[PDB]
Curated annotation (Swiss-Prot), chain D:
Species of provenance: Escherichia coli (strain K12)
Domain of life according to the entry: Bacteria
Oligomer and partners: The RNAP catalytic core consists of 2 alpha, 1 beta, 1 beta' and 1 omega subunit. When a sigma factor is associated with the core the holoenzyme is formed, which can initiate transcription. The rRNA transcription and antitermination complex (rrnTAC) consists of RNAP, NusA, NusB, NusE (rpsJ), NusG, SubB, ribosomal protein S4, DNA and precursor rRNA; S4 is more flexible than other subunits. In pull-down experiments interacts with CedA.
Biotechnology: Co-administration of salinamide and rifampicin or salinamide and myxopyronin suppresses the emergence of resistance to both antibiotics.
Similarity-based family: Belongs to the RNA polymerase beta chain family.
PTM note: Acetylated on several lysine residues in the presence of glucose.
Record protein name field: DNA-directed RNA polymerase subunit beta
Role played: DNA-dependent RNA polymerase (RNAP) catalyzes the transcription of DNA into RNA using the four ribonucleoside triphosphates as substrates. Resistance to the antibiotics salinamide A, salinamide B, rifampicin, streptolydigin, CBR703, myxopyronin, and lipiarmycin can result from mutations in this protein.
């Protein structure tokens, strides 16, 4: 009930948020990039994932 | 009036380490977990490449001939380069490679001011008949993290077209995330047990990173304590 | 019993004529004793506290 | 009190008996944690040998669910009381209102 | 997403993957601040004419 | 410690005598029969029973041959 | 009639403030509601159930 | 007396001793499940939200 | 190549309000020292508050003295919010004697040198009878946090009297601590922050003394990280 709203909010996408279009280098940089405060939790981005 | 300091500070090794610590006073779990975590992620002196000079190409949505990946992917290979320098404060490497095959990072020049820590870190796969890859990469010390988006916006170091800029991560950490969980001192159930879990990009071992982060933090509190 | 009947002779623990059935506070409770009342059948002497 | 009531509370803390509602208007003469003494007024005073009134309170006692029900004064010396006013709160009342 | 992790990776990882969701869902919903107000529920403007 | 016996059913594919096999070996370590084969890590006697079955050191067949020797092994004491 | 009473109190008309987290210190995006709800306390106490 | 020694002996009695939680109107077989206890302080039986 | 902040002016708006500022902060350290300071001050500042009262002719809390106009259950709930700061010793034993009609304010406590009441207009009870008389012997202690009467009973050690009305003690001289970092400006530096800790004590503890005892609670604790013992 509550977790399922947590994940839905975590994996949506706005249209123009902080740090859009930049390209990341994996799950580990995508996290800390958001913790520091630059990029928004749902902003369109290009990552590399194995 | 007279507080509790932690004993049984266990440390685990598996560039990856999962420190622990306990028993901290109640509510001191987070005020330590978040002070450190905001230092390793925000401000920490380090060195990382910042710009690249493709020897022939003047735009990222262009394409280099003979190179397998495109420059949008190549810069992804340079953004993760692990470099440490003892003496200098701005050094511009030179990689001018030929041959055919996986162009590793050990083909870079070897100057007395730099010392790579991941030479087999691949940068590009070269096709046949070309053997024509050269670039001038610029590493400069700094603190924290600074994207390339907010540099060119205030572009003050005017560069003609084709002076490629990369996202610079100066901090020696790659991820850090603490986790608090209850613990007791055999008579009190209001205690804590911090659990730090930290990684780094080779240039600094993990426990060495936490050491010189509690140092930067206990320096700011110098003009207050007795 | 026979075994305990040796246990008495060894230490001389006098067996009591009277069994203890006093009133004790129920478990898991604590609070001051704010009031006490005593009712006596008319025909039996009132003790000092009564 | 209820920060957002519905105005139909004073009719539930007076119609029940928990409050020590004043029975004849006058002037409070001796407040106390266990007694109130309402010096009656003139016109609401009986014809002969009237004097004054007095309300006792009910300090810490036991209801049917083992909770307590004790009353408290809410007035001081000199308040002009009136017919139907309130003198003693009860269990979950405040100045007449019904705070649950 | 839990079902496919059962049919493929068995039960050793799915019991430990069904918890890393609960620790991640609960965490990123608290930063969400997902509250409800009295202006969240928007009344349509053409409700009058339709009525 | 043990959280799931999914591994200790890969040896005994039944799940209804994994109880019987390990409830009997778990008694030999409690009533004064034997000692654990695997090294104990400050665990009870049920978890140590379910940790041997995973290592193949125990099953419904070994416990018979392992103990049917005792009569013959006691047969030297049986004269 | 409610909104006209909030505006007299200098509060925000919408009724939603921005709360800061307690442990980290960052601010919850998408502001939260904060009010004053009269809370009863029924007598299904725990230490009479267990 | 609840001497301070029993609180450390009671913790070793509950090393791996699964208990059985079961709710009142037990409809189906998932209404009874064991659990490995962990000693908390209070008087409410905590319970993992997924279950 | 870092900067370190220095204590700056302490605007004292009132007796219970305060505003202390930390001028030269390096970028990125605003919210790091703030929330690590707001989370310490609200938690573990040592204070002093009543520990056990004792009246002259009453046996338990739910009684009702004759002459006063409150149950004894309210005379304790009014003392618990009594602010007092002792300088020399560690614990005191106050006194209070009064007779006559009129509200017994806190200012009628016997005057000692070290014990220094702060809120002398505090009401405690009322007296409403000319031959009334109320005489108690308040107690006071130092500590931190919060320790209810029930859990402070475990160290009772044969509390022989039956007239020792026990109060719960919440020693803490802070009630709310807001802080906001803003654009400080040294003569020539691109980005420097300013911390402004708008504190609010209960008139007990000095503001500048709180921060110098909140920092040493942090700087004393980081030792376990500076020397990672393994």
């Amino acid at each position: 009930q509550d977790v399922v709203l947590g994940l839905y909010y975590m994996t949506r996408d706005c249209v123009n948020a902080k740090g859009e279009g930049m390209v990341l280098t994996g799950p580990k940089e995508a996290e800390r990039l958001y913790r520091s405060g630059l990029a928004s939790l749902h902003a369109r981005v290009k990552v590399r994932i194995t | 009036t007279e507080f509790l300091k932690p004993r049984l500070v266990d440390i685990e090794q598996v560039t990856h380490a999962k420190v622990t610590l306990e028993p901290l006073e109640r509510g001191f779990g987070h005020t330590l977990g978040n002070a450190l975590r905001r230092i390793l992620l925000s401000s920490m002196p380090g060195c990382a490449v910042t710009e690249v000079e493709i020897d022939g190409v003047l735009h990222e949505y262009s394409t280099k001939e003979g190179v397998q990946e495109d420059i949008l992917e190549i810069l992804l290979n340079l953004k993760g380069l692990a470099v440490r320098v003892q003496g200098k404060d701005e050094v511009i490497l030179t990689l001018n490679k030929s041959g055919i095959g996986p162009v590793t990072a050990a083909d870079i020049t070897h100057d007395g001011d730099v010392e790579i820590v991941k030479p087999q870190h691949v940068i590009c796969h070269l096709t046949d008949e070309n053997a024509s890859i050269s670039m001038r990469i610029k590493v400069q010390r700094g603190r924290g993290y600074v994207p390339a988006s907010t540099r060119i916006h205030s572009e003050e170091d005017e560069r003609p077209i084709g002076r490629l800029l990369v996202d610079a991560c100066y901090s020696p950490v790659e991820r850090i995330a603490y986790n608090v969980e209850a613990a007791r001192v055999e008579q009190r159930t209001d205690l804590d047990k911090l659990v730090i879990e930290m990684e780094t990009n080779g240039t600094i071992d993990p426990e060495e990173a936490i050491r010189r982060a509690a140092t930067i933090l206990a320096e700011q509190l110098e003009a207050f304590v007795d | 019993t026979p075994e305990e009947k040796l246990l008495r002779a060894i230490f001389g623990e006098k067996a009591s004529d009277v069994k203890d059935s006093s009133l004790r506070v129920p478990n898991g409770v604590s609070g001051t004793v704010i009031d006490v009342q005593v009712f006596t059948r008319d025909g039996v002497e009132k003790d000092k506290r009564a | 009190k209820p920060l957002v009531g519905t105005g139909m509370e004073r009719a539930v803390a007076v119609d029940s008996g928990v409050t020590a509602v004043a029975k004849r208007g006058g002037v409070v003469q001796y407040v106390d944690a266990s007694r109130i003494v309402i010096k009656v007024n003139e016109d609401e005073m009986y014809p002969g040998e009237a004097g004054i009134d007095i309300y006792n309170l009910t300090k810490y006692t036991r209801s049917n669910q083992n909770t307590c029900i004790n009353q408290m004064p809410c007035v001081s010396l000199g308040e002009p009381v009136e017919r139907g006013d309130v003198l003693a709160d009860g269990p979950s009342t405040d100045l007449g209102e019904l705070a649950l | 997403m839990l079902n496919t992790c059962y049919r493929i990776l068995g039960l050793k990882p799915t019991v430990i993957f069904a918890d890393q969701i609960m620790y991640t869902g609960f965490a990123y919903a608290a930063r969400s601040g997902a509250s409800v107000g009295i202006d969240d529920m928007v009344i349509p403007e053409k409700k009058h004419e339709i009525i | 410690a043990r959280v799931t016996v999914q591994d200790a059913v890969e040896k005994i594919g039944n799940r209804f005598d994994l109880v019987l096999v390990a409830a009997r070996r778990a008694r030999q370590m409690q009533v004064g029969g034997k000692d654990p084969l695997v090294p104990e890590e400050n665990d009870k006697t049920t978890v140590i029973a379910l940790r041997e079955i995973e290592e193949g050191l125990i099953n419904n067949q070994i416990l018979d041959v392992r103990e049917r020797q005792e009569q013959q092994e006691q047969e030297a004491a049986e004269l | 009639e409610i909104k006209e009473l909030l505006k007299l109190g200098d509060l925000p008309t919408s009724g939603q403030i921005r709360l800061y987290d307690g442990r980290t210190g960052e601010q919850f995006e998408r502001p939260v509601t904060v009010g004053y709800m009269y809370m009863l306390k029924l007598n299904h106490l725990v230490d009479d159930k267990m | 007396r609840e001497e301070a020694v029993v609180w450390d002996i009671l913790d070793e009695v509950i090393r791996e001793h699964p208990v059985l939680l079961n709710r009142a109107p037990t409809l189906h077989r998932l209404g009874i499940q064991a659990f490995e206890p962990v000693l908390i302080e209070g008087k409410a039986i905590q319970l993992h939200p997924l279950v």
